[PDB]
Design an enzyme around this catalytic site. Structure first.
Site, PDB file in Angstrom:
ATOM      1  N   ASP A 105      -4.037   0.770   9.100  1.00  0.00           N
ATOM      2  CA  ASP A 105      -2.766   0.347   8.451  1.00  0.00           C
ATOM      3  C   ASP A 105      -1.472   0.503   9.059  1.00  0.00           C
ATOM      4  O   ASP A 105      -1.500   1.321  10.213  1.00  0.00           O
ATOM      5  CB  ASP A 105      -2.422   1.061   7.071  1.00  0.00           C
ATOM      6  N   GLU A 123       5.391  -0.476  -3.224  1.00  0.00           N
ATOM      7  CA  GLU A 123       5.547   0.844  -3.492  1.00  0.00           C
ATOM      8  C   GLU A 123       6.948   1.417  -3.309  1.00  0.00           C
ATOM      9  O   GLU A 123       7.384   2.219  -4.431  1.00  0.00           O
ATOM     10  CB  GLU A 123       4.753   1.561  -2.162  1.00  0.00           C
TER      11      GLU A 123
END
Ligand SMILES: *[C@@H]1O[C@H](CO)[C@@H](O)[C@H](O)[C@H]1NC(C)=O
Length: 602
Positions: free
Chosen positions: A285, A491
């Site tokens: 990521d 998020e």
């Protein structure tokens, strides 16, 4: 003269081996490096033998860029890569997670939670097929989707990227993969990568593994669960992804029982590679290796060692490529990372590139530009939006007339609320910007526009964003449609404790419904506190984040189609209950998984 790896008639494994045997260590480490377009130039790409580029969320050549502008950007980067000694094309990745969503004029499909509500894996496959065509319209060959997170706590800011809290539904929706990549042949070996050719894209099952698990729904954090729970909830859809030939897997920022996924050799190599027999490439990521340490980035040498030794193949650096390449080269030269590990990483990256046809078609097809936003794909997104809607209430008492479907002919109707005429809000996160945005951010149809397109010509449609009670009582309306809900998020700003929609939302619903019968359309990425909205409303629809095609909402409000959607997750009574899943001793839902009312088409 003849070079076996350049020969399109040869088997992929022979071409991979032929190329690998020619490569210097700089050329090998280059393949393992993915950089942002924001730091790329032709010289950087050639000089560092770069293997991949990406656009992160919101990384675009300019606002409003046409499809041809994106193709020219990607081709300019590819021309530099093809000019290296070996001419290895780069692969360009992007988050096309509900359509080609960073791109102006791209069809925006419902987010995954609404797709879960449809229980229609063939619909999801068709959405993969359409998404591949719109990604290739922009010259891009690789989409970072599907997110196969099983979201177990709706306080997670990415819960809308999870099809369901039930892994069985997530497993069924891995049909996105052969949509994006093409169907695998009958003879196919599970774990091999597959892409059919230049009209399809490489896919990415993400984020491995347990990203939907986390404590308090806290993003990029600790999932605490035993192996049986990891294996029975969070892992199964990865095996379905292997069966369907997913080309890549992206690792999670999360940890499992305190061990960072980006440093987990047992899971990345022992399980994904050695047990599931995954033969595509494993990608980090964004700055995922940096976040192995606390603080993040405080020992980048260790981050490189730990991640590469764990079995990661390509690192989404994405900015500090010179430091990345320097540190990895140093580790190899010092014997800290063996050549066998570099050679495995490059084998996998080259395997995906050769298999997908990238050496044969490294450049964009200008004839594909016109696939962007095509009406047939908007008709599909409209179908998906309508199927995703879950009817929660349709009358205040068991003896009232059902409010929905509404009649298309009425003298005067009211459309109201902050979300009735706001394209950005109806699309949510990962649309144009990483975190989404407000207003008319792309091409689409708001709920107000969809109402005006649906109703009889004699019907007068009045819009008021936040009317007071007296305005509604005096307006001579037959009924109202009021749309409210969450603002766009990911998020960070999305990880939320209270799960209450912003005001004015409830106040507008209470003002409108106090004055005339009302259908409330709730736009959200997840279940939100809903008892007060329900108490005010005659009818209430959970519309999730339906995307650019607002006519999917009106197709069900006016009875062209019946409501068929069913909750793909549990609707809590209070946030105090959370986490609360089926089988928990305190399981006490407001609406259970699978709940949904129906109507018949008129
Ligand atoms: C819809 O139609 C079916 C019969 O085709 C009927 O059984 C059902 O009660 C109807 N549902 C509603 C909500 O009117």
């Amino acid at each position: 003269d003849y070079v076996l790896y350049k020969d399109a008639t040869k088997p992929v494994e022979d071409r991979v081996a032929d190329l690998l045997g020619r490569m210097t260590l700089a050329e090998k480490i280059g393949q393992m490096t993915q950089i942002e377009r924001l730091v790329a130039t032709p010289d950087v790409l050639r000089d560092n033998f770069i293997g991949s580029l990406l656009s992160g969320g919101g990384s675009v050549p300019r606002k409003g860029a046409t499809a041809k502008e994106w193709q020219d950007m990607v081709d300019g980067f590819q021309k530099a890569c093809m000019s290296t000694r070996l001419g290895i094309p780069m692969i360009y990745g992007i988050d096309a997670v509900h359509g080609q969503n960073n791109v102006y004029g791209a069809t925006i499909f419902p987010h995954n939670v609404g797709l879960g509500a449809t229980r229609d894996p063939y619909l999801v496959k068709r959405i993969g097929e359409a998404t591949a065509l719109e990604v290739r319209a922009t010259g891009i060959q690789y989409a970072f989707a599907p997110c196969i997170a099983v979201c177990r706590d709706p306080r997670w800011g990415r819960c809308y990227e999870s099809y369901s809290e039930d892994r069985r539904i997530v497993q069924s929706m891995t049909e996105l993969i052969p949509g994006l990549q093409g169907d695998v042949p009958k003879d196919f070996t599970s774990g091999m990568p597959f892409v059919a050719g230049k009209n399809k894209v490489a896919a990415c099952a993400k984020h491995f593994v347990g990203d939907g698990g986390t404590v308090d729904g806290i993003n990029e954090n600790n999932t605490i669960i035993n192996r049986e729970g990891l294996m029975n909830i969070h892992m199964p859809a990865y095996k379905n992804a292997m069966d369907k030939g997913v080309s890549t897997v992206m690792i999670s920022y999360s940890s499992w029982n305190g061990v960072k996924m980006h440093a987990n050799q047992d899971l990345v190599t022992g399980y994904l590679k050695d047990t599931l027999k995954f033969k595509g490439f494993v990608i980090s990521d964004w700055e995922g290796i940096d976040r192995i340490t606390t603080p993040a980035g405080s020992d980048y040498s260790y981050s490189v060692k730990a991640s590469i030794l764990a079995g990661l193949d390509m690192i989404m650096v994405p900015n500090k490529y010179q430091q990345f390449i320097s540190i990895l080269t140093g580790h190899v030269n010092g014997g800290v990372i063996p050549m066998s590990r570099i050679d495995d990483a490059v084998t996998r990256i080259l395997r995906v590139k050769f298999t997908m046809g990238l050496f044969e078609n490294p450049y964009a097809d200008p004839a594909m530009a016109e696939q962007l936003g095509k009406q047939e794909h908007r008709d599909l997104a409209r179908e998906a939006a309508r199927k995703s809607l879950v009817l929660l209430k349709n009358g205040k008492t068991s003896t009232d007339a059902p409010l929905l479907p509404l009649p298309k002919k009425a003298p005067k109707i009211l459309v109201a609320g902050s979300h009735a005429d706001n394209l950005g809000y109806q699309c949510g996160g990962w649309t144009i910007e990483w975190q989404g945005d407000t207003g008319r951010t792309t091409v689409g149809t708001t709920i107000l526009e969809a109402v005006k397109a649906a109703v009889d010509p004699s019907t007068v449609v009045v819009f008021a964003e936040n009317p007071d009670a007296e305005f509604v009582k005096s307006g001579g309306f037959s009924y109202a449609i009021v749309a409210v809900g969450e603002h766009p998020y990911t998020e960070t700003k999305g990880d939320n404790l209270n799960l209450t929609i912003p005001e004015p939302g409830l106040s507008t619903v209470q003002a409108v419904c106090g004055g005339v019968r009302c259908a409330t359309v709730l736009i959200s990425g997840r279940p939100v506190v809903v008892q007060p909205l329900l108490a005010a409303s005659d009818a209430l629809v959970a519309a999730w984040l339906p995307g650019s095609e607002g006519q999917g909402v009106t197709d069900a409000l006016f009875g062209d189609f019946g409501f068929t959607g069913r909750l793909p997750r549990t609707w809590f009574k209070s946030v105090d209950q959370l986490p609360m899943n089926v089988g928990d001793a305190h399981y006490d839902p407001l609406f259970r998984l699978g709940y949904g009312l129906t109507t018949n088409a008129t």
